[PDB]
Amino acid sequence: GPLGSERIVSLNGDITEIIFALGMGEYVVGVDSSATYPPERTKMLPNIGYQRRLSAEGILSLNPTLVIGDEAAGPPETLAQIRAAGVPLAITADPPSLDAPQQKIRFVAQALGIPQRGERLAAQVEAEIAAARDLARRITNPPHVLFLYLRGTDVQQVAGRNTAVDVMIAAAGGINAAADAGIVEFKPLSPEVVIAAQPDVLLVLDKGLESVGGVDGLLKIPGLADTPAGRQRRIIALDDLYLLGMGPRTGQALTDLTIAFYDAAQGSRP
Ligand code: HEM
Ligand code: HEM
Ligand SMILES: [Zn+2]
Ligand SMILES: [Zn+2]
Ligand SMILES: [Zn+2]
Ligand SMILES: [Zn+2]
């Protein structure tokens, strides 16, 4: 008979999104800084710190019955205090792979004792990813795409291979132009990178684009105005959790990218 009441502290924005997508959001009592979806619900919840800089006291003072996160959660010394306090904790992998959404969904569903709801969500996410990949197969002339991580004019980084964004670009039928500059993971933007990449599409984050003054500011960054992207103002700005979370909205984000890439394939050059 007896029913306990679950008090979940979720350590990562993408895990939080998945708890809410499974229908269990009312049991979440604490979230990290990156947990911006669904924004109306997560803005109301106590903050336990950023996912990689978690407060042990911020988590434990919420008296959780369960703490759940994935490999981005840290530091290790905070996880260790959770264990030493005797609070149930589980952590899952989060590889840069189109299999990560399904794996994280099954992980959360099992912890919450709803494996059937989890199979239903994973099957839908996989169907949405399938549909975007089918649209991406229409691209026979794939555009060169450069992802820029921006944090004002001071910080300008490009993402190469072994990143979630690299996986998203390729599955949406685009070419990650950071390979042409040799880039693995995150590396600084440079005159040399821009010459070698000459992207057709500039892919950025919402906040990043705001932090440089919008499209007008971005194209004041040396070299960018004169790329094929810069010339046609072909800038795609997406929310960070949406583009890079590898969560339930992965198929929706792939569809937005591939639609944009298809247009660039037709219109960027000559
Ligand atoms: C692609 C993955 C990443 C995303 C989505 C991301 C996102 C963010 C966001 C949303 C902020 C706060 C808003 C702002 O800066 O205006 C931020 C700040 C920051 N990011 Fe990142 N970032 C990423 C990767 C990195 C990496 C790899 C580093 C370090 C090597 C880094 C270092 C920082 C620092 C130092 C701040 C400023 C913290 C503060 O001022 O309080 N970021 N980032
Ligand atoms: C969905 C993807 C991501 C989102 C939404 C996100 C969000 C944010 C936010 C809001 C901050 C500011 C936190 C603060 O200043 O206290 C931040 C900082 C940071 N992020 Fe991320 N992040 C993401 C992925 C990543 C990745 C992939 C890395 C590294 C590979 C990374 C490493 C960092 C680092 C080093 C900071 C500076 C804060 C610290 O050192 O504790 N993040 N992120
Ligand atoms: Zn339980
Ligand atoms: Zn994650
Ligand atoms: Zn190339
Ligand atoms: Zn859409």
Of the candidates 130, 143, 161, the one whose C-alpha atom is nearest the C-alpha of residue 234 is 143
Which numbered atom of ligand 2 lies nearest the CA of 243?
A: 1
Between the alpha carbon of residue 129 and those of residues 62, 77, 119, 252, the distances in Å are 36, 36, 15, 7
Q: Whose CA is nearest to atom 35 of ligand 1?
A: 151
* Residue 235 alpha carbon to ligand 5 centre in Å: 18
- Hey, what domains does the chain have and what are their CATH numbers? 1-126 (3.40.50.1980), 127-270 (no CATH)
Spatial separation of the C-alpha atoms in residues 49 and 11, rounded to whole Å: 9
Residue 240 Cβ < 6 Å to ligand 2: yes
- For the annotated binding site for Mg(2+), the residues are 14, 70, 94
Please give the Cα distance from 39 to 132 (Å, whole number): 25
Q: Which method was used?
A: X-ray
Q: Resolution of the deposited coordinates, in angstroms?
A: 2.0
Contact of 159 with 185, CB cutoff 8 Å: yes
Residue to probe by mutation, ligand 1, list 146, 149, 187, most atoms within 8 Å of CB = 149
User: How far, in Å, are 58, 98, 240, 252 from residue 245 at the CA level?
Assistant: 24, 11, 7, 12
**Which residues on neighbouring strands pair with residue 47, listed in sequence order?**
31
- Whether the Cβ atoms of residue 263 and residue 269 lie closer than 8 Å to each other: no
Hey, what amino acid is at 119?
E
> How far does Cα 203 stand from its chain's mean position?
13
Please enumerate, by residue number, every residue annotated as part of a binding site for heme b: 53, 149
Task: Note residues around ion ligand 5 (Cβ under 5 angstroms).
Answer: 180
**Residue with the two structure tokens 């950025």:** 204
What b/e sequence results for 178-192 when a residue is b if at least 16 CB atoms lie within 10 Å of its CB, and e otherwise? Answer: bebbebeeeeebeee
**Which residues fall inside 5 Å of ion ligand 4, going by CB?**
12, 14, 70, 72, 94
Residue list, annotated binding site: 6, 14, 53, 70, 94, 144, 149, 180, 256
| Residue nearest to ligand 2 atom 32, measured at CA | 52
Q: What number does the ligand 1 atom closest to the CA of 240 have?
A: 5
Whose atoms come closest to the Cα of 183: which ligand?
A: 5
Ligand 1 atom nearest to CA at 165: 1
Q: Give a three-class secondary structure readout of 75-104.
A: CHHHHHHHHHCCCCEEEECCCCCCCHHHHH
Cα separation, 193 vs 172, in Å, equals: 23
CB 243 within 8 A of CB 14: no
Q: What are the DSSP calls for the chain, one per residue?
A: -------EEE-SHHHHHHHHHTT-GGGEEEE-TT--SSHHHHTTS-B-EETTEE-HHHHHTT--SEEEEETT---HHHHHHHHHTT--EEEE---SSTTHHHHHHHHHHHHHT-HHHHHHHHHHHHHHHHHHHHHHTT-SSPPEEEEEEEETTTEEEEE-BSSHHHHHHHHTT-EEGGGGGT-BSEEE--HHHHHHH--SEEEEEHHHHHHTTHHHHHTTSTTTTTSHHHHHT-EEEE-HHHHHS-STTHHHHHHHHHHHHHHHHHHS--
CA distance 11 to 81: 14
Sign of the dihedral defined by the CA atoms of residues 264, 265, 266, 269, in that order: positive
Protein residue with its CA nearest to atom 6 in ligand 2? 34
Cα gap 246→165, rounded to integer Å: 10
| Nearest partner of 202 among 184, 182, 219, 188, judged by Cα | 219
**CB-based contacts of 192: which residues, under 8 Å, 6+ apart?**
181
Q: 34 with 245: CB under 8 angstroms?
A: no
Pocket lining: 34 vs ligand 2, CB cutoff 6 Å: yes
Ligand nearest to the CA of 66: 3
